[PDB]
Amino acid sequence: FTLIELMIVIAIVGILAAVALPAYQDYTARAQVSEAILLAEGQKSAVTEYYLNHGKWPENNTSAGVASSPTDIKGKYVKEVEVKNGVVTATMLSSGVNNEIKGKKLSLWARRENGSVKWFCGQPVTRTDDDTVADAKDGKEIDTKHLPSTCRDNFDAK
């Protein structure tokens, strides 16, 4: 006979949350990845200096002169950050993150410019030789959709 204004408006806010759910869920993940990136960076300094001073990429965190323990460079969504031959990889925690990005990671690596180096940011990579890395293809890479426009670099970016 009457009461449909309360029933529809409670059910439009319910469906509004369902539509606002995936937007906040990638905005959210995309936000948790933007930090793995900040934790990865700022460690470029150590790695850059080590390379320019010696001409060899730092083998591990200790070589680069950073928390000798990967797990000591963690965060809220970051379970750690390891330096492996100049390549700095950031791992996403398992608690406090999206759902399709946890335990997932990215990498920052550089290239000899000769007198200086240039840095790249993208999906996990392994270093082959002092001037070549390759996709750490394995299945734990953070999905392209969660990576900034500034971190879409490919293993062979120059």
Add this chain to the structure above:
Amino acid sequence: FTLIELMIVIAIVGILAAVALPAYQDYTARAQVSEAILLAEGQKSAVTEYYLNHGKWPENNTSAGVASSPTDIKGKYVKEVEVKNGVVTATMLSSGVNNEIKGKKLSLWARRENGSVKWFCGQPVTRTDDDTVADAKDGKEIDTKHLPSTCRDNFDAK
């Protein structure tokens, strides 16, 4: 004989407002707290620098090099922001806020990482020693329900 469509639909919008009342009232409070947090932050800079440059936490706002007057770091819902030995506490005004959060506050404190510091955000805390704080247990802490997921830190968070 007839007119019930006008009577029920005026009474479903009335009850719709009553159901939408608590949702807007915590969404609202949760919004007024999210600012006390923004006003608390951005003062991390001063505090961080003071600590790294001297190895001692800033005793008060003036030491940290900020509005020497706590009340000078207020807002719409924020009655102020005081720095007490590196701990930055934000107080909720008494006018313009929820009802169960006014005159209530939170704290931001940091910890020596050795070469850098890490910040925490949560319910009011007091600093004991340069690397230890404790619950400013007293009854004026902003209730957990009003605090973001990013500001649920405990006095002993590391």
Add this chain to the structure above:
Amino acid sequence: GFGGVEGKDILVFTRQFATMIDAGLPLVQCLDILASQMDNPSFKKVLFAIKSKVEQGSTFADALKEHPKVFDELYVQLCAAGEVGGILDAILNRLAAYREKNEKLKSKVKSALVAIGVTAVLLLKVTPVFEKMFADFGSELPGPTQMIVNFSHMAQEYFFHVAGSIVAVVMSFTWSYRQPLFMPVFGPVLRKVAVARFTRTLGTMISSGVPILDALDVTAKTAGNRTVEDAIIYVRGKIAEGKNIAGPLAETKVFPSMVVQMIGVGEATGAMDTMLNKIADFYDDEVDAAAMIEPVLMVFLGGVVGGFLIGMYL
């Protein structure tokens, strides 16, 4: 466990007692008459039992106490207050008016959640839904805004349409609530209700054995509508002068050709009691059925809907 009686049936019987008692018949004879004129057995049966207590010398209030499931504490106390103060006649008139208002109010919620409730929600918002539907067919209609305004301003500009919807509601509510210079032309004259009451009262006093002229003198003092009271004083004056009852009636528009033709047969047959009883029950049933209560709905139904649509259009 026992139930009361219907709102209709309390009505008929309280009216017809108030009428007989205010006529100066003895209370027991009043009681006998309404029992003997009743159509349901349960009424005729009780009223014989209420009368049986009154002939043992009990008050009407104390006699009705044998049926507390039918006459509640508030009813008896009104009777007993009338009996204690010497106003039994005027408290029965009050009770008859009460019972009439109660039955009418009952029919009139219930009529059409039942069906009336579901149909009344459904009619009250039909239009205002159509309206929100045509105004939700996109953006940049007649009177809207662009969606990028700030919400509060957008909602306040549309206030026009929110208002035209509420008015639409108030209207269909009014039609559902109501609905269940020639100075003399402006006075409320006799209605269907007032003719039904008159006919029942007269059917009642004639079936009991009162003459026509004694019944008319009582009725002319207990008629509520002033214009009808003036009509009935003229009918009684005409009859007392020796004019024939059907001829005093035929001068007044409120009596159809048939009411008069039927009364005119009753005069020649000595069956005016039977005639008036069947006239009255015909009228009482016509009354409770009751066509302009549905046409004026529809006038305001679509007329308001259309006023909304035109409102924002412009």
Add this chain to the structure above:
Amino acid sequence: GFGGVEGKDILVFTRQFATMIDAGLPLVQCLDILASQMDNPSFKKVLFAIKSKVEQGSTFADALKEHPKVFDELYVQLCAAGEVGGILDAILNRLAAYREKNEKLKSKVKSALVAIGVTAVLLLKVTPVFEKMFADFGSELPGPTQMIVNFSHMAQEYFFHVAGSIVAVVMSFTWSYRQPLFMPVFGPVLRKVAVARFTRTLGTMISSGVPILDALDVTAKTAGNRTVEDAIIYVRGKIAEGKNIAGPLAETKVFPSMVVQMIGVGEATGAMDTMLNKIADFYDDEVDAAAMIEPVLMVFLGGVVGGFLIGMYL
């Protein structure tokens, strides 16, 4: 510029002519009677004018031609086809059934291209338009796709919503189409309609001056329901044997106690004509009130709309 008459009012008058003409009254006397029994002036006034042409010797079809705004070309041609073929009686019966179906169909769209056609397009797509227009508020709703898919896949995924719209349509079409062992226990008996028609026909032939028995012999040939025809043959057989009309009726459940009691007065009063006219008007108005044909619309109206909206959200 002149308008026709209401669907109700064409109905009553075409029924009552078909009835009188099939009784073997002269066409002019049929015309006189329905004019003289009419309640609206515009009907009594026309029908005097149609009769005035018939008494100059014109056909009924040519006499109705004076009111082409009331009796359209299709109506006159039906009359004139009946007059040319010697079947005026059976084409008037056809026209009366036509007018009855037309009025019933009118009440019953409107309740809760003419008006019926425009209102029926308009109701059948109101909701499905609402629907398409909420689903056109931008992209990334509940259940959509992104616009960059290939069109065929986008359209096939939404098939859900295209389906919920068609079902909405089918429903409102069903409500508009519908909505305008003891073997003897299973037969359709007399309804309200069939009693109203009977009463109108008899009220009509008595007011005109036919006796009761002549009216019953005509009516027993023009009654549509077979069980009522069997009832009426038994009533006429009883009356022709010397039993009193109210007593032949009282044997059959379809006549209430009030109907019989009212007829029983009319026998003793020589006022049966009119007793029947008032009974018939009471029934015709009870018929046109008889209201669930509009509440069940609205149940399926908004219930389907809401089912669509719920459907995609989920």
